[PDB]
């Protein structure tokens, strides 16, 4: 029902989530709230550098490529702990601590 | 000789907007209605068939109805099952703690009036709209497992009936009053120990 | 190892991405929600109050053994790169190296450290 | 804690919240504030709410001797849910008149 | 080595963060409860991207 | 000891695999099964002659 | 009205129960002293009694006193209609407290707890003696056929 | 140090507030808060007649969906001895032994969605779909509401119902073993469920428990034998039990019982005096005049149904056991048509009495598994 | 204004959309900027619609089990809504949602003709009935009879 | 090729009850670490040539 | 128990309730010749499990 199939459903959910009136709870604030998911998204976005796709289609030779990928894969937990602690109540503190 | 007349429309409601600035919010609300997510809640005599809405008899998940078990995330909640006096003082917290594009509806004839709990009992609440403002009232105890999808289709048009200037009718004010008390405090009764 | 200019441009672009998304959300957003807004998800009516919820006693040992056993890898990488380049002496040297920490892990396993 | 009868258009908050945000959702619960119908089911001009504000002392000081229990909160909300019904049954106040669902908890208008 | 890499990849990209369509992400949700709009969107993204 | 572990470490993994691959090739006929579930809302269910609707 | 098998075994100990007669359904009924609800509880299990039944409230009449009821049975492999024993003890609105069997057999952790708010008679031998059915906010004792059922807006004629 | 597990209650059976201490990851003491769904039937039950009170029972009873009407018809028909034919009794036996399934599914499915079986959630609903058509075509809308009148039942179930079990009647038989081979597979299924919330038999009878959860300790206190309920006992059966009582024992005892349901159904459809309904349909046209048909046997109704009937002093109890647990409705035998006092005795109210004593020194995941395996629902609890 | 091509002139029409509504709200959005103001009805339930659009008709409230005759004598919804309407308003745009299939009084096509006169004599009404995947509109008066 | 693993993970999503974080640590530490070291110890002599 | 077939049954459900007080169901328009599943031109309903044939 999102057209023929859900080919538009995905970006539809994206656009819906776009507005959704970000709430920013009281305990904890922009000091760490907006800072949380930024580290998460960058930790995996920057990894796209050394990933190749075909014959001479690499973005950077980067002889330390897979090493850089392994190093950037172990930065997300920082952002997860930050986000899960950006609030105060439970179900987010331990909910992020576990992961 | 009318009783309780309706207030006058204060604005003249005379304006005109550009298409390049209107179709944006038009398709935005189209996505907002075509990507709604349920919020899990269900108690009593008008709930159980909601589960069947996830299987091979009824499948409302075919439309992207992602069931979220959290208030702050989702926007569509079904007050399924007859509500009583209690479990309400924490129910309204859900409606208070989600983003503004909620547009909540009802479900269960025992939630629009309290049908089979309406002779004499100090528990059941007479309807839900005396607790939370919702849009559509759904009959049936149990509610017809197809009527809920039809009412979802009905409500699917109200969001499409919104414009760019309509994104200001969710802003609030504060009638915060300065009045104190003089009484005695009561210690916590729900002591959690065995 | 010739030009990381693409790396720098990707860094600045992907670091502008999150603040760009946040600001774009903020521009077309509602100036609303003056409700309670002081309590978070799935909470017993206003539950509020509490601390000393740590259980760090268990996970701290895991964190410690990981922090100690990690340094192995950043020493192995210069060795893992220089195997064929050099002879076979580095093979024996790195074997001694890794075997030391294998013994360490065996010890941490026998005496109760990695637990529930 | 903040265990208040938060019924529609009747939220007798047992805790101090009259900032934009209470900063603790209770502010140690020492004032017992109240906000009137955030859903704008009724539009308010100050004079109309002045009688409610005056009788608030009649309900918090004239007939209160019981401890801080929701028993007293229902004792308040009962007459609160009918003071508005009286103020409307004599035509002094009217309904929302906005772009919401425009629900009728007391039913549609009448011809007296 | 491929076996270990594949089995580790599951939990490394949060698979599974919740065991059941009804059972939560071990408390009520995976540290993304209050994160309502573009926040949960970015977390959904980062998960799929991992 | 370790010889018992050096004998059972393959046994644990072989039990894990005998269960995992078995369930995998069993649910293979489920992921690509040939059942057709409920159709669109234009395909409501049949109703026999004993029910109750609008009186 | 006569004694019972329990009394048949117990009279030799010179402590007799309240010998009441048959029930109405087709079985018998007995009674124990209100303030002595512990002796019966400690002797019945010695005889082999470890299952309760019919944990209900009661009233004498519309405008009457209160009471309580306790039927009892056992569980065995080879059993043929275990003996139907019933107790119905009356109590007054003043000093409404009868002992509880919570500390002899643990089959009634929450059974008597509903009567701790339901009718106006509480019971010791049971920690956490507070409301469960009715909200803690409410104070009154409902379900008495003479109790003033709240004549609020939500019960009587509201037009 | 203490947080509530949520009135939103991300679990199967509705709304349950669980306030529990938390030492980082493990818990020390938990407490349930009940009373949020007060159906208050104990009040209305005095201010009503019988027939206007008939549809009231399958309202706080929508999981069992049938184990509330057994006793609710025992008081009007089984007390004053309005002789229920053995054929209509066999029809009611078909009903009850199908409600056994109606409970087995609506526990195991959600029990599968609690233990860790992520996929079979929709599977058991797809299996259950046929019971919906049955309950609809038998007497009522979806829960078959109003299948019990006073002088018998509403109306003999139609012809496309009784003789037409065969589809699901042999489908689910070969379908059972699917779950039995899946549970022993992937011991991650079994590892998390074994050795949790174990209970003994002496405490199972000392705490007042019942149902297969108690039968799982060699107790075999299955009350499908001890009562001449409508003279059902002509049929044969097999007691289902285990010898542990814990969560895995709960699963075993609640997977080994539903195999007897279709067995009793097969006993009935060919052992019912009328047998299938189309059989009795095509038989009451060749012997319309007089026969054992339409006599004390082969009659749905004995006398006239109406809201007018007086009672004498007769306060009878029945401990009618459901696969979730026992049930009882005691009631002071009053001289008036409606009686003085009503009372209910549900299993949920007699189950959670051990709940705070079950989860001891465990973790949140352990609490989740025990609460998913205990086979508990609201609705019955509050009444 | 493609709707404006068949509303101001005709003042009598029926909407034949796909049975989902996910394409018709944009049309209603445009008709708030001329003098047309929404009145959704869901016609099912009322008796002879004349006394529902012109006369003071006693709408019997949902009863509460008791209380013999009790009807609050509800008013009509045309002249009063005009009184609330400004003198700057072109027409009353109204939607008879429950006009379809594909002492009450069946709101048959004669009743729609009699609801097609209030647009002309003394409300711009549009009937509703789901139809083909393409959103179409058609004068219901010719369909009426 | 990566699509194949996407599909494999999608399938595995509905074949195993993901462990609790009382077993997950055990598996990650006392199971994967020894073999993930031993494969390197093997491949050393394997690549010795 | 009604004398002459008065109280009967039907089966539809499009109750677009925008207010509780709009539910006065009087004599004849209750008929309305309802949906008539078989009388629609966009419906082909196959019988479900308990209404189709065996196997």
From Swiss-Prot, chain E:
Places the protein is found: Plastid, Chloroplast thylakoid membrane
Transmembrane stretches, start-end: 35-50
Signal peptide limits: none
Residue runs in coiled coils: none
Family stated for the protein in its record: Belongs to the complex I subunit 1 family.
Function of the molecule: NDH shuttles electrons from NAD(P)H:plastoquinone, via FMN and iron-sulfur (Fe-S) centers, to quinones in the photosynthetic chain and possibly in a chloroplast respiratory chain. The immediate electron acceptor for the enzyme in this species is believed to be plastoquinone. Couples the redox reaction to proton translocation, and thus conserves the redox energy in a proton gradient.
Complex and partners: NDH is composed of at least 16 different subunits, 5 of which are encoded in the nucleus.
Record's protein name: NAD(P)H-quinone oxidoreductase subunit 1, chloroplastic
Part of the full-length chain shown: 213 to 262 of 362
